[PDB]
Structure formats: structure tokens, C-alpha cells
């Protein structure tokens, strides 16, 4: 196990594994008790008031942070019992992460990744940096400095803001120049992020309603991935922000997401960056690693400890995986460094940890949080090492009911979040309404996507991979805690300076002439008023009178819900309403007049007002007329310029050299096809898939709103009765709620199928042909050039080979480019 001996906040100070410590700070701080849990890893069950002098208070600031959920409470982690609970939770979380294979990989890598000793001015001498060592005070009083790699401190006033911190150098960027530094992780195991999800309906038709609770193991794995990245000095510069346009009303106010976040999240999240930027980052960090190798080569002396040159040379060689030769020449081998970079960049990702834990979690960042939950995971009756919340041999093992906040009510408590539901907003009007900042579309800018297609080019002559990496990994030896000369009494250090993020303006007003989908979504909202709720089809009426609620069903539904009947036929009323709702939500129209669109669901038309046009049948007509363009709020700007014509190098009288040139030309032709396909797929994912995802989520929200509205109407009607009638009927609205939610799911599968078909048909009809035209022109410009190039020996055979190869376009295989069950499933039938 990771934690060898158990720790509690009552053990008297020892001086080896438990001790009062002092960490670097700008001023002077008092010693704080700390528990070492493994080699080079310590924990401080105290609130973060030491590393950040600016964060010297645990009270809510007047300006709320730009985070969808934030819980503030100064009382937490102030009592001894709370500290013991925190220590137990952290130990259990570390054990759970160490249980899995990928977690063991990550923990071994983090323990191995000791920072670099580049604090010396002499070009041939290595000296430890003060900002990477901490002091431990023995009971007698004589403190001793020690190295370390990780520190866990209870979060700051923002109790769920889990952001890694570090102490940098005056002129060096230790987090991105390959030097590395110890990472202080603000982690809290007693709180979790409670979000909603509806993508598991296909695999779990009996998926429960409500939100879901994120496993804290995933959050700790994310923070640990960030710490491991910053330990190896491969983090991306923070100014590389994923810029998003904010001028449009349908555009976000701002989403400060770094490229490091994209790299850490993994999965589809890692596909928002093009291959060019990834290659640039890889080459830049390769240059940094070779610089580090040269620095190791030129260094001859160690000052600060008794450790010899050989031991530290071996330690840093294991840290950076450098190919040192017989003469001690450390070189950055391309293959080993590439494997290490791939492992740290793509293997160590949140998506892989979600797959390994077998827990429900968000796939992209766009489905922001909605609640914060207080949890206790110290007792085994609530959370176990192996399975987590989804305990085995219970009713919570299947369908991920253990992580449900409505089924596992005993383990979760909904706390108050400080960020108001309409605290950050935009004012849209044509009745100026307030639309939440986190409910808006994600619009990437055109600058974030860069390509080298127009540049010329010259011709010369899954879990399986994780298992293989485990079989090829080593867990034999970890770096030792070598004695080091004591540092100063106070470690003077300053946190790494972060780039300033300008406050996004709040309450920007937009004047329009058409009804946005947000207006229609808001028109289907009520306030649980005691007065009778009336359904209507005019969105203007719903948005003016808050008692009225807009509905996109037929007039029969409105008539049926707007009538009045005594308790004699209410028993019939309930079943008629549930049957009509199930019928209308499950309605479908089949057509073949639009390519790749076999389902043309009409009621989407007036629900989200996608077509800017009232009639649903006219929406059917508009869809079969104009393809999947109507769904997208803003048409993405896809532009493939003229491809770089190949430059084959002539080789006179060397026939086999000519053959190698003609083979490399074909290979790079296929690779160019694949790369253009990948670029277009990335554009489709970034600019179109997010819009369809938001439309799907908003349609689910609208359906749930309609169900809640009709449920409120029937509840109000039932409340109007007498007590004897209520007892005789015994109308249990929970059963009807479950029935209507199941009808919502039965409609949701069809809605998912339709939207998946539309989002794949847009790629097949309006994005791929643009590239295919360019590459067909490229083939036309290449075949004649190659024919000129061949003008001795096997002339005829070469001509047949080239004509056969460039006669047909390479087939588009969506499987190799995007890995998702729904998209592949809908692409299969065509």
C-alpha cells in the first residue's frame, strides 16, 4: 500500500514521518504540523494561509469568482476532528488511486520526478533551490531541511477551487523550462462536484433522474496529473489560452481554459488542438530536454549535500530518461523521449482514469457543474478502496446508482453555492431577458486552428496500450531522501507569477429581431406558484405572463391540460396525460429525401426554435431543403487553401533511387490525405459538435421542464380535492414522476439518434467535400508532375502503378479519428 502506517491528528511529534514543518513563504510563518505519507510526499491538513500571503483570509471576497459553483465556509478544517477526517480521506484517496494500474503509473512517475538543481550561477556546479525544500523541526528545536515533491494543503477560501501552486525562480520558468518544482496541491476529499448527465441513456435505459456526484478519485487524479506535468517541466505556457469569440450574443462571455487543461483532460478534449501545435510543443520541449542534457553534461560539482556526482547523475537520468553513453554523454534519444512525452501527455489523462475507475463523469468541460456536495468517505460503509461509491453486491453497483444524488441520498448533502444562478449573465432582447453565462454556446476563434497545408514539402529517399506500457514499466527503485545541509531559518520564496486575466464584462446588452433558443427555453419555466399553471403555444405570452408556460405540443395537449374535472375522472386523467405525453415525446417522421438523415423529428422545430420559423411541418421541409445547416447557430468557417505541391528531387541514372522517390511520393500522398482528414475532423468536432451537444442538452432541459409543468398542473388539481377523496385515490405523484421521466428517456434515445445523425451528416456533406475538392485538385497537379518526373526502365509498370494509386480517393474512416460510441454508431448506417 502507498501509506505504510496510518496517521491521526493525535500522534505526538516524532521528527521523521510526523513533524512540525516550515514551508517557503514571502514573510515569516509559524511551524505547522505535517504528516509524511510516502517518499517525498507530505500532507498538511490545514487551510491554505501559508504559501499565499495574499490569501491570508478565509472569507468570501466581494467579487465572486468566475466559476459556476463555489462554496465558502470559514468553519471547515478548524477543529481537530475535521483535521483527522481530512487526513483519513486523503490517505484513502491515495490508496484508491494507487490501487489502479494507471494510478500506480502516475504515483511512481511523480515520486521519481525530483525537480532539477539549477539554482547555481556556476555553469558547471549544481546547487539545490531554496523554493523546493522545506524545514522540519525536531522536538529539541534544531530544524533540518529536506527535499520533497508534493504537498497537500486544504483549500483556500474557495473550498472547491483545486489549483496547483508552486514557488518559482527569479529569472527561470521552472514549470516549463524542464527544471521542475515541487507542487502544492490544494485538495479537499470531503467535498465533491455534483453535475448532470444524460448520455448514458442508451446503455442504461433505467438511468435515474437528477444530478450525479463526481468521484473525488478522478479530481485527485486530475490534480496529480497537473502536478506530474509541472514536476517534469513540460507544462504549457499559461498565455496559450484557448481564445473564444465573445462579441456575438450566442457567444460566451469568456472561458479561460488553458492548453494544459486540454492536455490533462484527454479524450475528445485533447482533440481541440491541431497536430501542428502539438508538434511545435513536442519540438520545443525536445529542445528544452536537450538543453537539460547539456547542463547535466557540463556540471562537475555538487554543493549542499554529501551525495556524490554519480548518484545524482543516475537520479536525474532516471528522471528525464536520457541515453547516457559510456563516456557519460547524456543525450535525449528521440524514441525514449517521445514515449515519455506521449505517456505524460496522452496516457496520463482524466478520461483514462474515468475509464479505469468505471465511474460516470463529464466528457468535455462544457457541461459545467450545477451543485457542490458534502461527502464523508472515511467509513467503509460509504466509500471503499476498490470500487468507490459503486459498492459491490448492493443495489448501487449497477447503473451507477451509487454516484446518483437522488438514489444515494444518505451519502450526499446539497450545500449552498455562493455564485448566484443569474450572477453572471447576458441581457438579450429584441423584454430584455437574462441568460446565464454558463448556458451559452462555445465558439472557438479562427486563430486557435493553424495549419501548414499551404507550406511546400520536398521528397527525398485503448486499454491495450496501457497494459503494454505497464508490462514495459519499472517500479523497482524510487529516489531516496538524501541528507542535505540545513537551509535558512525562513525560506524566502514567492509563488509563480500568473498572467493577469481581465474581468469579463457582465450584463452586456444585445438588441435583436428574432427569438433566440434561450428565449424559448426560458418561456418553458415556472416558479412553482400556488396559482394554476396554464400552457400556451405563444412564446411572447409565456415570457410576459409568468403564470403561463410555453409548450411545443399539439393543441390537443393544451386543451386536455387546460380543462377541469372532479375526482370522478381524475383517475382517468392521470393515465390520459401520461399516455399523451409519451406519445407526443416519442413521435417520429421517416423520410429519405435528405441524405444520411433517416429521422426528421418535427417537434424540435418549435421547441428550441432552431428554424426561426413556427410550423413544425415547415421545419421538416426546411430540413430536407437545406441539410443540417439549420441546427447550427453560427456557420463555421472551414477554409482549406491550395495544398503544397510536391517537389520530387531528380536522381539521374539511379533507377532504384527513382523507385524510392516514387514510393515516398505515394506514402506522403496517403499521409497528406490522412492529415487533411484529421484537420477537417478536428474542425468539425470543435466548431459543430459542441453546438449539437448544447442543443441536445437544452432539448433535454426543455422536455424536463414540460414534464415538471404538467406535473405541477396535476398536483394543483389534486390539491383542490377533499381529504376523503385524497385518501381514497392515494395518488402518489412520485410514481407518475418516475413514469414521466422514463417517457423522457424513451424520447431522449430518439432525440440522441436524430442529433447524432445530423451532426455526422453535416461532416459528410458540408465539410468533407471541401477538403476532397482540394485534394482532387492536388492529385491532378501531382500526377502530371510525376509523369514528367519519370521522363528509365520500368516505365510502363510505374505508369500503371501511379495511375492506379491516384485514380481513387482514399475512403473516409471516421473510426480512426474520433472515438465515441454514439458518433460511430450513427455513422455505421449510411
Residue numbers in the entry: 2 to 431, 453 to 483, 495 to 824, 831 to 869
Can you quote the paper on this entry?
Botulinum neurotoxin A1 (BoNT/A1) belongs to the most potent toxins and is used as a major therapeutic agent. BoNTs and BoNT-like proteins share a common domain organization and are produced as precursors that are cleaved into a 50 kDa light chain (LC) and a 100 kDa heavy chain (HC) that with the exception of BoNT/Wo remain connected by a disulfide bond. The LC is a zinc metalloprotease that specifically cleaves soluble N-ethylmaleimide-sensitive-factor attachment receptor (SNARE) proteins.
To obtain a more complete picture of toxin conformations, we set out to solve the structure of full-length BoNT/A1 by single-particle cryo-EM. Towards this goal, an inactive variant was recombinantly produced in E. coli and purified to homogeneity. Particle sizes obtained for BoNT/A1 were consistent with the presence of a monomer. The best subset of particles yielded a cryo-EM density at an overall resolution of 3.8 Å. Based on our 2D and 3D classification, the semi-closed toxin state is the dominant species, although BoNT/A1 appears to sample a wide range of HC domain orientations in solution, including the open conformation. The conformation of BoNT/A1 seen in the cryo-EM structure markedly differs from the open conformation observed in the X-ray crystal structure. Superimposition of the cryo-EM and the X-ray crystal structure of BoNT/A1 demonstrates that the LC and the HN domain arrangement is very similar and that the two structures basically differ by a ~ 107° rotation of the HC domain. The state of BoNT/A1 in solution captured by cryo-EM is reminiscent of the semi-open conformation of the closely-related tetanus toxin at pH 5.5–6.5.
